[PDB]
Write a protein that binds this DNA or RNA. Structure first.
Length: 393
RNA sequence: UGUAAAAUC
């Protein structure tokens, strides 16, 4: 802090001194400015703030990447946008040019990415769209998606910019090798998740024109083709299993839920049920499958696999006592008890499938009855016994 | 008996 600067200090003093940049990167100095710029500003105070804070590229970049300064930058941007005077256009154009030119570097900065984010939602839409065009289209875009901070720029784009402007991001991410890298990442998955939700024709998109719905659909199909083509890899992955679960769980993605079940899960239920990550996906599939697929799933567990040649152990034996598989059997049982007890719809496709649920329940009850002694050794076993006991009444 | 995210004074 400059020598000449103690409480009861004026904003004009700071602005006139030429020492703003020193205040803005200081904890106490920036604390002062942040409070001062909330008050009533005259035209000239605003003019000076515009010039010193967002007027020259280097100082703007210096403050934007600063732990304290980035807040002041955001406040002054807000004030610039609220001041519809004659210099309005030149200021917003300049701000767009500054960020545009250092896009990647600002995205990857812990503090500057915050400046990018408030600019995206606050700037006039037409100028915010130009910021989006400045996103990199190479390895650097993956870098942004997998960064714990930068990924939020992409999420903000998805939230507040119309799809046409970021369609290149959808196609970039659907590129097989990009999808593999991004979906194998903790933060990269969050980016794909938010895109999927934006691209879903849910109650949140009813404000779209039909042309915009058509655009949304194409982008959805292109992304989902890539997702379903790598479904096996994604369903079993530590991070991307959550995405597959979301797709299977969401009624508004019903057709993709079915694609996944048919071409990924079916015939692999026994093995997937024994995976740490995929076992959760299998549960979701049971919970949300349409009746016809559900019947195939059940039939696969009860009679899809040949029992062990020596011991006579079947798929259901393995699963009941497996560290992860036991949760799938509990899920199967709970579905059946919910159906038979009315807690779950049994009609679907014009028909009441109650008889099928009773069928599957009887099988499970017969198995649990015969194995009650071994099952009572385990928490899962006791849970199933109790589930069945609570049903009788 | 079994997993992620929710990121700045």
């Amino acid at each position: 802090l400059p020598t000449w600067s103690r409480s009861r200090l004026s904003l004009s003093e700071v602005l006139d001194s030429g020492d703003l940049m020193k205040f803005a990167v200081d904890k106490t100095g920036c604390q002062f400015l942040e409070k001062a710029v909330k008050g009533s500003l005259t035209s000239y105070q605003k003019f000076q703030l515009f010039e010193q804070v967002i007027g020259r590229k280097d100082d703007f970049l210096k403050l934007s990447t600063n732990i304290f300064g980035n807040y002041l930058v955001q406040s002054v941007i807000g004030i610039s946008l609220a001041t519809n005077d004659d210099g309005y256009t030149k200021r917003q154009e300049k701000l767009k040019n500054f960020i545009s030119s250092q896009m990647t570097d600002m995205c990857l900065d812990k503090f500057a990415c915050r400046v990018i984010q408030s600019s995206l939602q606050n700037m006039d839409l037409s100028l915010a769209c130009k910021l989006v065009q400045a996103l990199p289209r190479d390895a650097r875009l993956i870098a942004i998606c997998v960064d714990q901070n930068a990924n939020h720029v992409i999420q903000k784009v998805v939230a507040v910019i119309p799809l046409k402007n970021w369609e290149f991001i959808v196609d970039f991410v659907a590129t097989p090798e990009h999808l593999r890298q991004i979906c194998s990442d903790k933060y990269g998955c969050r980016v794909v998740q938010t895109i999927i939700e934006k691209l879903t024709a849910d109650s949140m998109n009813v404000d779209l024109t039909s042309a915009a719905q058509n655009l949304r659909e194409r982008a959805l199909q292109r992304l989902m083709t890539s997702v379903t083509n790598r479904c096996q890899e994604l369903a079993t992955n530590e991070y991307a299993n959550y995405i597959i679960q979301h797709i299977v769980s969401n009624d508004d993605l019903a057709v993709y839920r079915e694609c996944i079940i048919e071409k990924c899960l079916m015939r692999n239920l026994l093995s997937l049920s024994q995976e740490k990550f995929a076992s959760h996906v299998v549960e979701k599939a049971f919970l949300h499958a349409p009746l016809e697929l559900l019947a195939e799933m059940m039939d696969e567990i009860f009679d899809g696999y040949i029992p062990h040649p020596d011991t006579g152990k079947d798929a259901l034996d393995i699963m009941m006592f497996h560290q992860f598989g036991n949760y799938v059997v509990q899920c199967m049982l709970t579905i059946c008890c919910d159906a038979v007890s009315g807690r779950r719809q049994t009609k679907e496709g014009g028909y009441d499938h109650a008889i099928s649920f009773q069928d599957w329940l009887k099988k499970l009850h017969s198995r649990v009855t015969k194995e009650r002694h071994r099952l009572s050794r385990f928490s899962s076993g006791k849970k199933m016994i109790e589930t069945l006991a609570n049903l009788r009444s």
